[PDB]
């Protein structure tokens, strides 16, 4: 119910594979929504709280022992009119819905009072890193789990891209410490080594 925030730095973190093509021992220049190097990310502690903004995609980092953090909600107004996206996952199985939800303020899981016009259903230390994007009706997710803020590189692979066809400008979490950063469109130079894995990257406008 209560939340406090600090600010920290990202040491060249949040790089993902932009295509499903195998390459090896090359340098490739790409342009897409990336997390700029040496950003000013936010660090939230939650103790027992408005809706965070969703400018354009988001980078999420967490270091938790178990399923303390469960899912997310996305939308514009979230009250009764605008259709809202709800994603809830507990044991690697995720329920995703796009319904005119009525979300209770300060939602938590033991979220919404009522839903209408869902028209959609979908069932499917360690640092959890996630990247969320929403472009041209496609809501896309990249994820990675890294054994360990830290330095170095660790690429992220793509889970699913789904058609929702809704405008998203705010997002909220339902579950506790985590890190949040925001993406921007820019150009990167990536290095592929022998085993088609990205080893180094250069930000083209830093």
């Amino acid at each position: 119910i209560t939340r406090t925030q600090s600010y920290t730095n990202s040491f060249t973190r949040g790089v993902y594979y932009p295509d499903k093509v195998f390459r090896s021992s090359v340098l490739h220049s790409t342009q897409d929504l990336f997390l700029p190097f040496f950003s000013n990310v936010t660090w939230f502690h939650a103790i027992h709280n408005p809706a965070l903004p969703f400018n354009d995609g988001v980078y999420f980092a967490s270091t938790e022992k178990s399923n303390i953090i469960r899912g997310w909600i996305f939308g514009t107004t979230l009250d009764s009119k605008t259709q809202s996206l709800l994603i809830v996952n507990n044991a690697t199985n995720v329920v995703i819905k796009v319904c005119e939800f009525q979300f209770c303020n300060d939602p938590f899981l033991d979220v919404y009072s009522s839903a209408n016009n869902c028209t959609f259903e979908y069932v499917s230390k360690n640092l959890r890193e996630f990247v969320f994007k929403n472009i041209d009706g496609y809501f896309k997710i990249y994820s990675k789990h890294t054994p360990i803020l830290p330095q170095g590189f660790s690429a992220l692979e793509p889970l699913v891209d789904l058609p929702i066809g809704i405008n998203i400008t705010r997002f909220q979490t339902l579950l506790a410490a985590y890190y949040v950063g925001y993406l921007q469109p820019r150009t990167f130079l990536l290095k592929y080594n022998e085993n088609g894995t990205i080893t180094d990257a250069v930000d083209c406008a830093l």
């Binding site: 499903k20 093509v21 195998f22 390459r23 016009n117 009706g137 058609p163 066809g165 809704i166 088609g196």
Partner: protein, 326 residues
Amino acid sequence: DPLSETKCTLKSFTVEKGIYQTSNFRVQPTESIVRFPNITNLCPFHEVFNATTFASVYAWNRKRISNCVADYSVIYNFAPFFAFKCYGVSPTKLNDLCFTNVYADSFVIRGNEVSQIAPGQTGNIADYNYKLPDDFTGCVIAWNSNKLDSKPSGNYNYLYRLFRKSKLKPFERDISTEIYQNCYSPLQSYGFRPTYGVGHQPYRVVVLSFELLHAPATVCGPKKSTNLVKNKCVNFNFNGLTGTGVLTESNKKFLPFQQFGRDIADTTDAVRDPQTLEILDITPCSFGGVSVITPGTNTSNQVAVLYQGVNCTEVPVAIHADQLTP
């Protein structure tokens, strides 16, 4: 003979002393193979084009098609349209391609608004109801339904959005009924009557959109796979990727979401078999250049041949007329 080839290259009947770079030799493929995923069930196109009710344009109806065998030639049996309107592909090749998954969007509009269902268009329909990307790949089908969605008194079951604060984005919808902000209702209903003109009559529209095979394919045309041949110069067809070359077992590491690999010049070098899920390297078949050495036709017609940059033990030896270019 090589001397005749030299004469033709020089466009003359007399050739002097020297060594002339005549032409290039290549090895021809032996056989052909086709590799497609094994699937039996058919795609459900009958429930889309022969539905009893079509949704309103402001709330268009979407259907997802995946994991089926797609036979497009049957679509002509369901609706009395005249022709497809396809962007990025031609309707006659749709049975020769594999797609990841397909989307079918259905609705109803007025006759003269059908031109707004193309890329790069504006207007109320294309601004506030249904928008399409500037770079679109797919097909559009529209046909008249005057004898189904028209009533003598007037049909008011079809709605469209007139006012909106801002224009939509490709493949975006909103179904709210908030009073527009001297206050006007946002939605208005077509008045459809049988006596109106051709441009004022109802039209049913269905849009098919595909994905251009950047991942494993779940919907493919009705084609039959063949056996797999590795170590011979052959023509191959992997899920629509056509080529000529020699296949070999590969040791490259492909992540489960990776289907093939490219070269510096965006040339395919490795593929993943759709059935056995093994990695295969692809190489071009043998090629080289030939030069003809002659002492001049004014003296003799004896010539020597130089194969450039090849090992003598590996020079072509096939005697069949359908194995070399010369």
